[PDB]
Design a protein around this nucleic acid. Structure first.
Ligand SMILES: *C(=O)c1cnc2ccccc2n1
Ligand SMILES: *C(=O)c1cnc2ccccc2n1
Ligand SMILES: [Cl-]
Ligand SMILES: [Mg+2]
Lengths: 8, 10
DNA sequence: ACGAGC
DNA sequence: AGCGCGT
């Protein structure tokens, strides 16, 4: 859930 | 949600 | 370097 | 109760 690189 | 931003639900 | 969403 | 990742 975090979008630091995927934001899923 | 999603699993995925499961379902809603399951 | 990071946890979101009925 | 129920789970996914890439720059
Ligand atoms: C969002 O909180 C989140 C948490 N853990 C994960 C593990 C693997 C892929 C995606 C994920 N997303
Ligand atoms: C994005 O592609 C990505 C990949 N690896 C990570 C590791 C730790 C924190 C954030 C990250 N983001
Ligand atoms: Cl599933
Ligand atoms: Mg499953």
């Amino acid at each position: 859930x975090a979008x630091v690189x995927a934001x899923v | 949600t999603x699993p995925g931003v499961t379902x809603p639900g399951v």
